[PDB]
Design a binder for this molecule. Structure first.
Ligand SMILES: C/C(=N\NC(=O)c1cc(Br)ccc1O)c1nc2ccccc2[nH]1
Lengths: 583, 583, 583
């Protein structure tokens, strides 16, 4: 019960050891470092603060590094500020020039080759939108009709609604920035402005030089990105959906259909997805979010998001803790009121049916149907945790892993609470450890059911390929079961027939030596029966079977051993008797 | 293809004949008149403007009247403005007094009997929240700890988080206001602050005095409302979900779960539901809505809403047309990308399975499975249009009705495009008119399939109870069909065997007199065969059957009559041949 | 409730007017005339006897003519009887010769060309089996190793396990025989030894010369038949499955898998199928059938057979009536204990989903789900009755037809009880007649639900294309319904509050003028409420709604008009009140 994960952006208002503790307590699962700003120095400082606080609190929190990415920008402007009339013309020059209401320059000198007549060109996050009138490569200029009017500062951004923007995958800075990440064993790289698989592989080839093992999550901010979503995930570990960045390039009437589709496309492949930006932006100034924002977050959860990001709310905002507390609260509420039967049925149709997924499916169903308290998923890499997660079961997924670092990668995937236990080689070891790891988390106790799952043998494990259903211990007494049923009830040990006369409701399991004629009238009024010694056609057995009361005969010293009044579950098949509630 | 209906609120920025035209063209289906403000005079003015513009454009637009409802308010304040410290006390007096940071009066003199110690009291739309400390009916005062601080103007509102608020169902003004509505044949009454069935019946008994026939849509703005949703709809025609009004009384973390539930509860009973307030509020100042707002609207559509309301956007906003255009666009997008198979399957489980609903179910399935272009639903009252609508089929629902006024009531229900055609008594008349009405809407043409549905005989019609599947005319030629198949293909009339020699792809249906030995080699390479005269064991029949090519023999003058090159569909069962594409 | 149809073979022990009556009463639906034996004279005699007795009892019984077909036979034998050693050789000569343990002749002089070395040749219904050793066309002889030993009479039969047996489709006698059938308006032709579509079309071309309109049911008795089952049914009206004839050519270990498949292949296409031969053969000598035979019949019914045939049992047997009585009894038993939900679900998957079948599907589901007493199917040709039949609904199918002769064709199709009512042109007429025809059969009465279905307009009817769900009359009283529910209960008209005091169980619908304070305590203890006059917010309405008791206010003179103590059904939606049980 916590399920959807929370990414937080670290900055001035959350650098302190004091605050990072409050954020981790508030429910942070991944810290984000935004390399669009700040020096390497600053970030290293925050990486230390995080790691140390994280281990002091004994909690797994990953570190995500968000590249600035390529971008198109205006060169400087004459007087620093310049204006554009609403029916006029402006020439967008590939050669650098001082700004003016006519001539006006961009850093991406190759802009002229990506646009055509009638292509739109948005300036400063869509503040004022142009449109290409004529193109003469002669002078390398683009004549443009200024559609909406407004002002224009110096080094402001430019966007070309797709349009295959022909920037490279990564800046030279981005290379510098992701090498820094390799050096600090950072867990996630969120690559900006991704639009082709090329643009992700450019990162992954840097990672493979170092044999890094960092997950790469592309950002998808434009039509080319949307269009290539399948081909990109083929080559990616997860995905971030930046609504605000996306909103600049595509109509905001159309964004939530695209969010819903990308998130669904990630669910299909078990790849985690983060929904980002514009989440609780009002909490930068206020100590409580607006209805619109709550709805917005809750709908990301319903769309099927693995995680949910905070930006300025936690980075520079006046209320960083309250933002994270409030995020968790929406998350819990939204999940609280959702139908896991529909949810499973949905995924069972959505995700492919294959050898590779066969045990995600069976586990999910088994878990729902038998009401299993926890699924414990043994992984080296995480792929078993992800496989179980994609089928969205009510049951808590516990990821037991020997890798500290593939445990931080589990911190982002949906519904997985990872723990680091030390590597078992044999299957037997793995199963037993699983059951023990589960109990020690405090979530599962004695009555509860558990599904243990992993890829075995732990060596040749490519895919997850076995499950065991396990009852968490451990029959207090046992014998020869008569009938096939079961009941939970409170005990009433009887030495005499009068030791249960004028003091009997039903709802109780009686425990005597054997059954006389004097006992038969009372046994029918009871829930269950545990007799001490006897055979299958004993008077105790024959009265239990005939009266449809699940019983166990042949139970060692049942009168002395099993306690009076304490609540008990008897399983007639098996012939076992349990401490409290069972299954 | 338009589906989710749009209500608009008329006011200063949309009174003009000029603008109301632009709104109706933008896609308005129901105009809302807000009686919380404005005189009867003003509203009558707008009612005329609407009707006249509506008929000039030959479009069905309903008129919804939104009552102000009861309310609790602060009496006037000393100096007009007053302040409240954040850890202090304030006495809320049932007796009228001048305002002060201590004593302070409300119009609902019965407030003291609804609250208890520890009940919250929100002032001015929750701007500053109090909490009841002690209650002494002696002095008829409520001592309260002022929790959040802030200011307090004169005639400002008060809310008691439920708390059975014990106001009456309707103001004396609300009575005056709904009688005005009866006088102007207004189509809908949106009753504010509804919380018990009593509060709706108070309106319906005024309507029954006049034998009015206006639909009553309660507003549900508090916990008591939510709690009594089933009992209220039992006694109501539809429902409005006012998020903003609701947000004041219940936590905005919790609102979207309630919205989703109320909308679903309305879907269950075929009652139309409007999602209202806070929709595209940014378009009061901007010519385009924000991502958050688009997502918000789209999610109402996905929750299963029949209609979607605009308030200030259209009433007082700087951009009324752009709000309605932008609302339709979101609506179309959101529906475009939704799975009608899931949607039907969902409703088939959700809505009850009964004699009354038996034909909604069958029509929905038939429509989805056979891909029917339109469902034409014949109604006197609307109940058949609603019954078909609740099962949410892809197919356009056309509501053919004799009643002009039960056609305006159809303007709000999901997916129904109503038209007024004059009453047919006999079933035959109704079916034939249906098919003709459908064609004249321009949506269905000759290839298309249609389901006609209504309650028959038109007299004893309580429920909707029959369907006919009809192909929209009208076999161009026919004969003796051989085989049981069918194909669409372009014709090639052949007089000679050489009249199809060195000029043949497949993909064509050949039309000759009869088949020789010289024809058999070419018939196998074809899609279909129409031979002129012949019997069942003719050479033309036997070669069509053996080669698995659907054919029709015995076709009158096929060579001369049916044209060359024009595309055609042949149905081997039936022995009919059709103009273009068929089924 | 009777469902699976019974064909009987007429002969010496069932020619009499006396017996044919006893057979029709026993449940005969189709009389079979076996043209393998007997003169035209004899058969004409029986055709008259049948028709006359049939119309005297006012029952629809069809006449089926079973052609002898082609066959291979031994020419005469030396001394009339001859013997064959078990390891010896026999020469099968194409030229006619006297019989001997060596040389030995067959009538099918073309046998040599159909067999090859190692092909088996069965003599006298498989009594002794040969096997081809060498073939020399030189002498036109087939040397054969005699595998099993035994004797051999004169004009005995020969079979070649497929082997494309190259006989013609029909004997010259068969032509003579089917022309006789055309002359006597016989209803069915069972064509023997069918194995290609050619063989059926040979009959249908004779029928088309006369424009006959007789249904053709091929017999399928060999591997070539089995193999071509799909292609044959394409060209056939139904099918007979002759197990005994089939058993000679293919291993009896394999026959019941083939029966099950053919029957299923017929169900797929809505074509009726008869399971024939070896049914209750022991009843030729005994007055009761054996367990094995009962099981055998019952399993045909479970395989999905439309009809079940009797041969010698009724034709020459000592117990013709008892055979038919006993056949019906098995039929009823077997159907009694079968799951129509499974059965529908099965067919819904089995039969194609098409425009042509769309209303079979919806009717079947509607019928099962609402528990409709009868489906009345209006047909000219029968195709609607067959369409409804193939989806196997519990509900009795009633076939209302203007054609006396397409009513006898309905006598064989599963679950259809046909009646001849005179042609209505308009849809209204058809619907109304339907409801009237159903009631007059005595099967449906006033409470019952009915589905009326047909192809409309009755003219352009190719396929069946509409359904109406109708409640069989006819509200005794009505008014303003409050609530939406319904209940069956016995009335208790109350003039006073004391007119229901010390004499009240629940389970009763009270009928008073209006409700006082003195009435409210008693209304809650009741099942339903019918008050005389009142409005929607009357004291009578408000107490019915609040207490969840379905009520109807505003009922004309309810106290005087609706009777006391008589059982009644009230429908709160509709505001109708019914005679007994409703829906
Ligand atoms: C599934 C189906 N119809 N179902 C019902 O009419 C129905 C009625 C009730 Br009362 C309860 C359950 C039901 O399913 C259907 N009709 C088709 C027509 C054409 C093609 C495919 C079709 N599939």
């Amino acid at each position: 019960m916590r399920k959807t994960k929370i990414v937080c952006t670290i900055g001035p208002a959350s650098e302190s050891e004091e605050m990072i503790e409050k954020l981790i307590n508030a429910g942070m699962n991944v810290a984000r470092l935004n390399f669009s700003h700040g020096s390497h120095e600053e970030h290293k400082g925050r990486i230390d603060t995080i790691r140390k606080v994280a281990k002091r609190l004994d909690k797994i929190v990953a570190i995500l590094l968000d590249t600035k990415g390529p971008e198109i920008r205006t060169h400087n402007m004459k007087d620093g500020i310049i204006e554009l009339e609403r029916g006029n013309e402006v020439i967008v020059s590939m050669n650098e020039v001082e700004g003016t209401p006519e001539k006006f320059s961009v850093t991406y000198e190759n802009l002229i080759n990506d646009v055509q007549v009638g292509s739109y060109i948005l300036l400063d996050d869509g503040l004022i939108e142009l449109q290409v009138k004529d193109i003469d490569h002669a002078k390398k200029e683009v004549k443009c009709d200024i559609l909406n009017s407004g002002e224009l500062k110096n080094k402001k951004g430019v966007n070309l609604p797709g349009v295959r923007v022909s920037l490279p995958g990564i800046t030279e800075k981005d290379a510098e920035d992701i090498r820094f990440g390799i050096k600090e064993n950072v867990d996630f790289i969120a690559a900006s402005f991704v639009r082709r698989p090329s643009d992700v592989l450019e990162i992954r080839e840097i990672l493979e030089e170092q044999k890094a093992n960092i997950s790469v999550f592309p950002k998808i901010e434009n039509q080319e990105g949307i269009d290539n979503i399948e081909e990109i995930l083929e080559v990616s570990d997860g995905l971030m959906v930046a609504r605000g960045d996306m909103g600049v390039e595509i109509p905001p009437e159309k964004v939530p259909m695209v969010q819903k589709d990308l998130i669904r496309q990630c669910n299909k492949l078990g790849k985690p997805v983060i929904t980002a930006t514009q989440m609780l932006d009002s909490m930068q100034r206020n100590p409580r979010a607006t209805r619109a924002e709550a709805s917005d977050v809750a709908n990301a959860i319903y769309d099927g998001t693995d995680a949910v990001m905070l930006s300025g709310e936690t980075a520079a905002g006046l209320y960083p803790e309250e933002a994270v507390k409030t995020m968790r609260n929406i998350a819990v509420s939204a999940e609280a009121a959702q139908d896991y039967k529909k949810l499973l049925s949905d995924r069972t149709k959505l995700v492919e049916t294959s050898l590779v997924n066969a045990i995600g499916i069976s586990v999910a169903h088994t878990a729902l149907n038998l009401n299993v308290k926890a699924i414990v998923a043994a992984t080296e890499s995480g792929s078993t945790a992800r496989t179980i997660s994609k089928y969205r079961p009510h049951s808590d997924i516990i990821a037991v892993t020997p890798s500290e670092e593939t445990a931080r990668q589990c911190s982002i995937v949906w519904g997985v609470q990872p723990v680091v236990k030390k590597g078992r080689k044999s299957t037997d070891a793995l199963l037993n450890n699983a059951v023990a790891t589960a109990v020690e988390t405090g979530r599962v106790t004695n009555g509860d059911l558990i599904i243990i799952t992993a890829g075995v043998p732990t060596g040749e494990t490519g895919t997850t390929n076995m499950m065991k259903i396990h009852l968490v211990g451990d029959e207090i007494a046992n014998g020869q079961g008569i009938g096939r049923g079961s009941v939970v009830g409170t005990t009433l040990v009887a030495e005499t027939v009068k030791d249960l006369e004028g003091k009997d409701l039903s709802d109780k399991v009686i425990v005597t030596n054997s059954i006389d004629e004097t006992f038969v009238p009372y046994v029918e009024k009871a829930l269950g029966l545990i007799t001490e010694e006897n055979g299958i056609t004993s008077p105790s057995a024959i009265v239990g079977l005939e009266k449809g009361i699940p019983t166990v005969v042949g139970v060692e010293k049942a009168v002395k051993n099993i306690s009076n009044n304490v609540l008990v579950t008897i399983d007639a098949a098996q012939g076992k008797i349990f401490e409290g509630y069972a299954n």
